[PDB]
Each structure stands twice: as structure tokens, then as C-alpha cells.
């Protein structure tokens, strides 16, 4: 009945959304992952004396 | 300090002791699951289990619920009289119909005593009874004739009588559970309920129950599902049974089959208004099996019962060879003795000896 009346309006609202290049997002993710790589004990094994679990 | 460690150790010891105590009582119980379709009789069985074994059996709420079913039943028959394709109709009662439509749609009703007098008179109309005999097309509650006849007894602000709770229908919004003990053994029967669903993603949770109970409406082979023009009510049950049997998760669970609602089938078969051959053409050439055990009857009704059972059994006998079993039964849910007579098959005794520690041979 009137279900399609609201759906088309919602889809029209969704369509008008700004989008950016994939290269910028890729660069941002790579830069963040390279910047915050120091404090990840899973990658680089923790020392035994510094490991609370051992 | 060491005091904190000692206190933590004491708390851990207490918790471990409680868990060890509870493990045995958890492991010493049997769990059962109910399944089926709408208007099949799942909750009636659990209500009867409550009535029989456990001593448990809000009376004010039941008083309103019984009257509510009576109110809905009277409106449905009259409303479809004009909308029916045939010109069937009932003179002065046309004035009664005027406020029947008005009271059909209302947030609440005060149940005036004047309503009972007019409803009883309309029920006595010859034309009104004629439309009741043709309930195949329009949907109507099964527990209608029983309540329609008994109005004055309920009318004379009253306490519900015996078997009144077992006949009234109330929808189960959530889960519906019941605990009971039969003889030094604690059981656990629960009903999933939850209206109607088509994905059943919660079925993965039930991977450890001992048995699955299946109930069908054996006297519903000419009325359609709640959403109209779909199929016969029996076919909707047959399709659901096939899906349950051929399920990845339920690959090692047995099934106990109840062919519920037996008395209605006997009454409807005696009348020749509807024939099984029309909806099920293969039944015309069907021959009764050589092995049989009729209770106490008419070969006409007896032949009908085994045909429906045969269709259900033929589904399970093909896709299941080992680790799957099917148990036919004949039950009438309302009759207290019949479920007691089944005694759950002497507690499904047949199974208890073989399934258990016999397979390893």
C-alpha cells in the first residue's frame, strides 16, 4: 500500500551522500596501522618478565 | 596481603562445591521439545501434564478468557453470512445484527446482560446453524460449539468449571515451560511457541534433547492455513515434517508422533459432506493394510486413520536408516484418560530398553 511511499523517500535521502576516493581511505588505513604498530603485544612477542600471564 | 588470597581461595572452594553439587541434578533429568503447526494442540498436552502429575492445576483471568472466546465466536459466524458466496441467510434478529457490527470492533466490552439474551436467540436461528455446517471456507475457532451451548451456566460472575481451561485457547507469546516428576525421575517439557517463523535459526540451540514430540491436526484436511488460499492444513504439516527430519543439526534425534484431535475426525468422516478422495485422489484406490488393530469399529473411519499415518511414515522410512526412528500414536488431547493411557508409551518404554546400551552390540 503506502510502504513504498516511505521507502523511496528513504532511498532518495540515502543517495544524496558525499563520497571520497578509495585511495584516500587506503592511505589513511595504512598510515594508521603503521603509526600505531608499537603497542601491539600480539605482533611482537612480549618479554617473559614483562608478561603478566607468564 | 595473604588474607586476600586466602579469602579468594575460600570463595573458589565454596563455588566449586556448589557447582559439583548441581552437576548431578542437572545430569539426572530428561528434556522434551514440542513442535507442530498452528491450532494443533501443543500447549494442551503441557496443561494436561500439569493437571495430572504435579499438584498445580488466577481464576478471575480464566473467567474473562472463557467469555472472550465466546464473544469472538459469535461475531465470526454472523459476519461471514453476508460475505459468503451462497445466499444463505436467516426477521426481527436483524436489529440484533446492528450492534453486533458495532461491538465487533471495540477496545473493550463491559459484557452487558442484554448481550447474552440476543446472542442465545440468534444461535437458535435455523439459518445461523446452516452457516456453521459450512466452516470449510471461512475460518472459525474449533472450541466454539462447546462454549456457545454453555452460556447460562457461565452467565449465572461464575467460577470456570473443569475442562474449561483445557478448551479455551490463549496465544503463547513467549516460551512455555513445565517441570514435573513421575517416579523418582524429573522431566522437562517446554514449548517454543513464538507464533509462526520460517527460518528457525534457534533450532541450533536444541542439539541435546532426548526426544522431539510432534503433534498434527488429523481432522484438518479441508481448511486452509491462516493466510488464505495457500494449501490444505494437512499439507502444511507434511511439508514441515519433511524439513525437520532432513535437518543437519537434528541428525540424531528421534521423533514421537501424535495424531491429535481424533474425535473430530470420527464425527466428520461419518457425515458425507466432505470426501478425502477429492483433496487426496490417491485415497480412492487405497487398500487397508493386512495388519491392523481397531479399537473396541466402522471400517470406513478405520481405513481413513491409517491412510494419514501411512503418508507421514513414508517420509521418515526413506531418508532415515539408523540413528533415526519414528513412533506413530493415536491420541485425543482433551480426554484425560487417553494421554494417561498412552502413559507416554509406558514412558516410551520400548525405547528405553533398546536405544539405551543396545546399539553397541
Amino acid at each position: 500500500i503506502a510502504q513504498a511511499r516511505k521507502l523511496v523517500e528513504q532511498l532518495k535521502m540515502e543517495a544524496n551522500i558525499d563520497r571520497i576516493k578509495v585511495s584516500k581511505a587506503a592511505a589513511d588505513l595504512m598510515a594508521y596501522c603503521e603509526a600505531h604498530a608499537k603497542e601491539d603485544p600480539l605482533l611482537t612477542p612480549v618479554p617473559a618478565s614483562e608478561n603478566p600471564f607468564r | 596481603q595473604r588474607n586476600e588470597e586466602k579469602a579468594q581461595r575460600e570463595a573458589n572452594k565454596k563455588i566449586e562445591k556448589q557447582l559439583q553439587k548441581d552437576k548431578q541434578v542437572y545430569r539426572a533429568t530428561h528434556r522434551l521439545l514440542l513442535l507442530g503447526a498452528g491450532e494443533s494442540g501443543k500447549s494442551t498436552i503441557v496443561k494436561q501434564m500439569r493437571i495430572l502429575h504435579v499438584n498445580g492445576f488466577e481464576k478471575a483471568t480464566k473467567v474473562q478468557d472463557i467469555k472472550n472466546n465466546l464473544k469472538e465466536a459469535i461475531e465470526t459466524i454472523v459476519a461471514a453470512m453476508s460475505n459468503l458466496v451462497p445466499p444463505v441467510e436467516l426477521p426481527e434478529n436483524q436489529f440484533r445484527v446492528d450492534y453486533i457490527l458495532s461491538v465487533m470492533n471495540v477496545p473493550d466490552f463491559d459484557f452487558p446482560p442484554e448481550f447474552y439474551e440476543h446472542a442465545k436467540a440468534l444461535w437458535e436461528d435455523e439459518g445461523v446453524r446452516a452457516c456453521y455446517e459450512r466452516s470449510n471456507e471461512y475460518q472459525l475457532i474449533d472450541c466454539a460449539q462447546y462454549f456457545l451451548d454453555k452460556i447460562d451456566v457461565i452467565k449465572q460472575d461464575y467460577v470456570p468449571s473443569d475442562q474449561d481451561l483445557l478448551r479455551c485457547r490463549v496465544l503463547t507469546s513467549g516460551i512455555f515451560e513445565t517441570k514435573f516428576q513421575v517416579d523418582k525421575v524429573n522431566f522437562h517439557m517446554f514449548d517454543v511457541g513464538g507464533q509462526r517463523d520460517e527460518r528457525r535459526k534457534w533450532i541450533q540451540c536444541f542439539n541435546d534433547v532426548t526426544a522431539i514430540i510432534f503433534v498434527v491436526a488429523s481432522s484438518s484436511y479441508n481448511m486452509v492455513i491462516r493466510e488464505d488460499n495457500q494449501t490444505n492444513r494437512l499439507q502444511e504439516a507434511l511439508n514441515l515434517f519433511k524439513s525437520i527430519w532432513n535437518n543437519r543439526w537434528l541428525r540424531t534425534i528421534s521423533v514421537i508422533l501424535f495424531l491429535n484431535k481424533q474425535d473430530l475426525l470420527a464425527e466428520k468422516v461419518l457425515a458425507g459432506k466432505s470426501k478425502i478422495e477429492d483433496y487426496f485422489p490417491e485415497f480412492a484406490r487405497y487398500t487397508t493394510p493386512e495388519d491392523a488393530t481397531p479399537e473396541p469399529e466402522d471400517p470406513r473411519v478405520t481405513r481413513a486413520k491409517y491412510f494419514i499415518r501411512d503418508e507421514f511414515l513414508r517420509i521418515s522410512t526413506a531418508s532415515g536408516d539408523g540413528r533415526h526412528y519414528c513412533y506413530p500414536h493415536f491420541t485425543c488431547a482433551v480426554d484425560t484418560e487417553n494421554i494417561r493411557r498412552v502413559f507416554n508409551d509406558c514412558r516410551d518404554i520400548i525405547q528405553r530398553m533398546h536405544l539405551r546400551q543396545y546399539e553397541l552390540l
Partner: protein, 232 residues
């Protein structure tokens, strides 16, 4: 010239049985541990060296015989307990879901170690006195018959009648039932039957020889390695 390696080959063969037994959880799975524990590594291997007498210490022979006797009695008791548990579980399903193994082991020790530790022996005969003074094996005072009754009559008392009701339920319930039941009883009975026919024969009257009795008792000692393979 070729019989030299036969004894060593048999001595090396039973090592495989010991390894298989040592290679191997629930309420009923704790009983198999006793059968796995209770012999072929120490008592059985000594026979190959004894086939030549070892004659190291007169005190050691008593332990050598008593260990084997206790192991045999423990194995018989464990199989009887297994059969009893299976019958109890199958027959009555209403109520089915360390203490008894220790009692069974304690029962074995009383009959075996006590006569050996008490130095009690057969009737003092000229051959008996000469053999005991200087490895013979023969008792008196109906010790053999009583020991057999404790350790061989238990099977026919239990194992014969334990499956009479279980197999009766097989026909009623409705092949494979007799295919595996015969293996369990057949291997048990066939290997452990012959010695009951010679121990009674020797004490009563002789009509038997030492070598044939030794061979008969050696036969069936492989039941220790046969049981681990059959179970599970």
C-alpha cells in the same frame, strides 16, 4: 639347532603385547584401567629364562608365582564386574546415570599372597621334600580346587547367566547381537577352560605330565594382550 631363537622370539613377541596394553573416560571406562594395569613385562618374560631353573634366590620364587596368581584373579574379577555392570545398566534403565576395584584387588591378595607368605606347601613327599629343599609347583589340602572355585567358577556363575536375560531381550526387541557376544565369551572361555580340566585332574590323581601342564598354563597367558585389543 633352530629352536634356540624360538624362545627369544616369543620373549620379544610378548613385548609387543606389553606395548599394546600400555598404549591404552567415563563411569564405566575407569574399570578398564585395572585390566590394563594387571604382568606380561616382568612375570611372563621370566619364563623364557626359566626354560633353561634360574635359581637366584629361594625367596624370589614365591613372589614370582604369587604375582601371576594375583594378576589372574584380578583379571577374572574385573571381567566379572564388567559383565555385572553391563547387565545392571541394560536391564534397569530407570536408575543407571575406585570403591569396587580396590575391593576386588583386595580379594585377590588374600587368596594368593597369604599361602605363599606362610610357606605352606604340599604334602611332604620324598620327591616333594627333595624338590622343595633344593621350580616345581603343586599344592595339597584341596587348595587347587578352592582357588579355581574362587577364580574360575565365578565366570560360569556370572558370565553364563549375565547374558541369558540380555540376549533374551534381543529377540523380543528385534544378527549382529550374536556376532559380537560370542567373541567376548568365546575368547574368555576357550583360553581359560583347559586349566580347570588339569588342576582338578592332577590333585585328584598321575594321568597328567608336568610339561603338558606347563604348556597348557602358558597357553592363555596371552589373554592379557588379547583383552586390550578386544575392548574399545
Amino acid at each position: 639347532v633352530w629352536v634356540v631363537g624360538m624362545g627369544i622370539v616369543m620373549s620379544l613377541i610378548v613385548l609387543a603385547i606389553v606395548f599394546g596394553n600400555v598404549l591404552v573416560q567415563t563411569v564405566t571406562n575407569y574399570f578398564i584401567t585395572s585390566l590394563a594395569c594387571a604382568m606380561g613385562l616382568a612375570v611372563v618374560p621370566f619364563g623364557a629364562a626359566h626354560i633353561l631353573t634360574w635359581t637366584f634366590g629361594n625367596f624370589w620364587c614365591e613372589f614370582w608365582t604369587s604375582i601371576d596368581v594375583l594378576c589372574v584373579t584380578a583379571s577374572i574379577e574385573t571381567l566379572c564386574v564388567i559383565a555385572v555392570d553391563r547387565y545392571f545398566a541394560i536391564t534397569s534403565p530407570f536408575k543407571y546415570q575406585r570403591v569396587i576395584i580396590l575391593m576386588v584387588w583386595i580379594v585377590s591378595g588374600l587368596t594368593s599372597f597369604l599361602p605363599i607368605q606362610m610357606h605352606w606347601y604340599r604334602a611332604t613327599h620324598q620327591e616333594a621334600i627333595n624338590c622343595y629343599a633344593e621350580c616345581d609347583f603343586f599344592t595339597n589340602q584341596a587348595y587347587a580346587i578352592a582357588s579355581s572355585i574362587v577364580s574360575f567358577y565365578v565366570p560360569l556363575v556370572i558370565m553364563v547367566f549375565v547374558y541369558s536375560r540380555v540376549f533374551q531381550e534381543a529377540k523380543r526387541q528385534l544378527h549382529k547381537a550374536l556376532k559380537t557376544l560370542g567373541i567376548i565369551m568365546g575368547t574368555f572361555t576357550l583360553c581359560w577352560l583347559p586349566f580347570f580340566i588339569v588342576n582338578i585332574v592332577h590333585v585328584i590323581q598321575n594321568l597328567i605330565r608336568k610339561e603338558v601342564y606347563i604348556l597348557l598354563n602358558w597357553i592363555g597367558y596371552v589373554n592379557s594382550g588379547f583383552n586390550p585389543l578386544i575392548y574399545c
